[PDB]
């Protein structure tokens, strides 16, 4: 037959049993229990577009000898009370680090790097560490899910897509619930339906651009 | 040569041009002080719901209509009203404001339809789109005839662009022009193919991070 692609996504959908999903989580309690910061993976990364480069130096080589000229800017105070804590060795409170701003300059958490030099403190600020820094979670749990979600499907999950992909999981939206499907049950509804997918790839992307000129070699 | 890697031919290609046997030359630096870059992007032509809430662009509109009637809309505020009780604004004003409405468009533009007598000495004021069509060979043809990737990538200040039927080469402040057949043929001599930045295989049909399509 003749429906409409958005028809036939529509019709795609109202195939699903919410019922007999996998498992499903709420959206309230993934904000509540993960901060956006802690999810996407380039908060792993130098901040290098966040702080001024020069600023992102200092402070490296201030916490590499605990010496030398101090980064004053208000933008990098809290990484500086940071970087001047570890060095002296004062303590720094959960209460810290809840409205600290979670990421560190060069790539990480302030949580994350506490550890590393107090590993007694490890358990206690796991709340506090990006999903990537925390112990590799057993499969079927929700930061299991989370931790082998690339970009493309966190941000889907952020923004509260409708659905997304990841892996071999269907996710889809319906009010405050996220229900998961498997690929069986996703491919099966996309052919009753009448509708081919593809996830979102760089493979489109060209990465020899220079302006609006995508180069390309030809013997 | 097939040795050559794929960066090495890009730069094969930029050498084979003939700096003084360009069409035309345009400095950066007086482009830039010529045309603000809010001037040329596209988008600037439409409405900033991106920039400011809906429901204060839609009281902008309503107040603009009948003259009578926040902090994030004191500057336009204030040439509403300005529009509205008469008061004929000043060039230093518009070289000093935001230039762009947030309907859209630009303020140097709106102020000239209702008087149209000021409107040859607010044209550095306004948008490119909302000029008159400059003849062929002029910098304002050329860049009233940038698509938004072209617009970019002159703003960005990039090594090389293409515009219509013209290749923008970068060798430091100064943009030189070629024509279509020389862009091709260094092209060919460097062992290299080219296209343009396309939409063409933008997926429009996503739901998150899945693009749907009709099964064939
Ligand atoms: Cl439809
Ligand atoms: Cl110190
Ligand atoms: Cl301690
Ligand atoms: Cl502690
Ligand atoms: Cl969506
Ligand atoms: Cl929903
Ligand atoms: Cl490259
Ligand atoms: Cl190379
Ligand atoms: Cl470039
Ligand atoms: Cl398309
Ligand atoms: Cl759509």
Redesign the interface.
């Known amino acids: 037959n003749a429906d409409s692609?958005?028809e036939?996504?529509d019709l795609f959908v109202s195939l699903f049993d919410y019922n007999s999903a996998t498992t499903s989580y709420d959206i309230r309690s993934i904000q509540t229990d993960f901060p956006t910061r802690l999810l996407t993976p380039d908060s792993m990364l130098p901040q290098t577009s966040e702080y001024p480069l020069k600023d992102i130096q200092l402070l490296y080589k201030l916490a590499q000898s605990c010496t030398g000229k101090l980064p004053l800017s208000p933008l990098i105070t809290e990484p500086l009370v940071f970087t001047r804590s570890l060095c002296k060795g004062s303590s720094l409170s959960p209460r810290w680090f809840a409205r600290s701003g979670l990421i560190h300059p060069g790539g990480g958490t302030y949580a994350f790097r506490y550890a590393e030099k107090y590993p007694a403190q490890f358990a206690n600020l796991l709340p506090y560490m990006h999903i990537q820094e925390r112990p590799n979670a057993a499969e079927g749990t929700l930061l299991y899910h989370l931790q082998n979600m690339?970009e493309?499907?966190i941000?889907?999950l952020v923004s509260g897509?409708?659905?997304?992909?990841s892996g071999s999981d269907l996710?889809l939206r319906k009010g405050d619930i996220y229900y998961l499907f498997n690929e069986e049950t996703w491919l099966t509804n996309?052919?009753k339906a009448?509708?081919?997918?593809?996830?979102?790839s760089a493979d489109?992307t060209?990465f020899?651009?220079?302006?609006?000129?995508?180069?390309?070699?030809?013997?």
């Open positions: 692609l958005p036939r996504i690339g493309d499907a941000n889907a897509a409708s659905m997304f992909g996710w996309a052919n009448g509708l081919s997918y593809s996830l979102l489109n060209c020899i651009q220079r302006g609006n000129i995508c180069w390309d070699v030809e013997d």
